[PDB]
Design a protein around this ligand. Structure first.
Ligand code: HEM
Length: 214
């Protein structure tokens, strides 16, 4: 398509479906999620966003990313830190798992941020725009499945407090993405990186499912 935001959505429909079809996510959507399983997903989200925001902060002034730099509206690290303290306790930093599949995702994020920063937008799009769209549906399913007490914590990740209107912000974020200047060769790679992001999530889901079935 013409607009990058339009091209991204179009090219990732197939892999997005695969994500939804992943056994781990199938169970999740069927409301068949356990606390042990939800803890693992929160853990991986932490590693993922720490690496991602670390790289974004590194290329924020670069012309290949600056346009989609919205730190206050999107940053998720503090949110996950709060959440993990609830899920794994005060010593969460010493006990949260950091699995091989999580590491493979983290390693690709640092690789892009450091050797192909022009592709970072692919990951910011996939994480942030994704979380902002299908984030509510998964949170709804989660709480309704988890049966959390009433301690007022554990799900801050699913709320973007600095964004008043999700639809208005996504319009803006798409605009900014469509303003990025890139050669057709780069655009094709940004498109490919996005699909790869999905694949990294799928192999993560496959790993988490394996760890939980024993
Ligand atoms: C398997 C559970 C998932 C469900 C049920 C889910 C659901 C949704 C829904 C309902 C939307 C709403 C906006 C729309 O469709 O127009 C959406 C958009 C999106 N999702 Fe997912 N999603 C899931 C997993 C993921 C994963 C693993 C990623 C990637 C890390 C992701 C990335 C995206 C992106 C980037 C968009 C926005 C695309 C665009 O606007 O161009 N989703 N998702």
């Amino acid at each position: 398509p013409q607009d990058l935001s339009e091209a991204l959505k179009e090219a990732t429909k197939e892999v997005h479906t695969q994500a939804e079809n992943a056994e781990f996510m199938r169970n999740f959507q069927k409301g068949q999620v356990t606390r042990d399983g939800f803890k693992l997903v929160m853990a991986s989200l932490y590693h993922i966003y720490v690496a991602l925001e670390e790289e974004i902060e590194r290329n924020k002034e670069s012309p290949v990313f600056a346009p989609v730099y919205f730190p206050e509206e999107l940053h998720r690290k503090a949110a996950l830190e709060q959440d993990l303290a609830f899920w794994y306790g005060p010593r969460w930093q010493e006990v949260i798992p950091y699995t091989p599949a999580m590491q493979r995702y983290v390693k690709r994020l640092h690789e892009v941020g450091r050797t192909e920063p022009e592709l970072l937008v692919a990951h910011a799009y996939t994480r942030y725009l994704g979380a902002l769209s299908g984030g509510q549906v998964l949170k709804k399913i989660a709480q309704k499945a988890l049966d959390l007490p009433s301690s007022g914590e554990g799900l801050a990740f699913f709320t973007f407090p600095n964004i008043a209107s999700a639809t208005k912000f996504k319009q803006l974020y798409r605009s900014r993405m469509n303003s990025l200047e890139m050669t057709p060769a780069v655009r094709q790679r940004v498109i490919e990186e996005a699909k790869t992001a999905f694949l990294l999530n799928i192999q993560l889901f496959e790993e988490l499912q394996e760890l939980l079935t024993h």
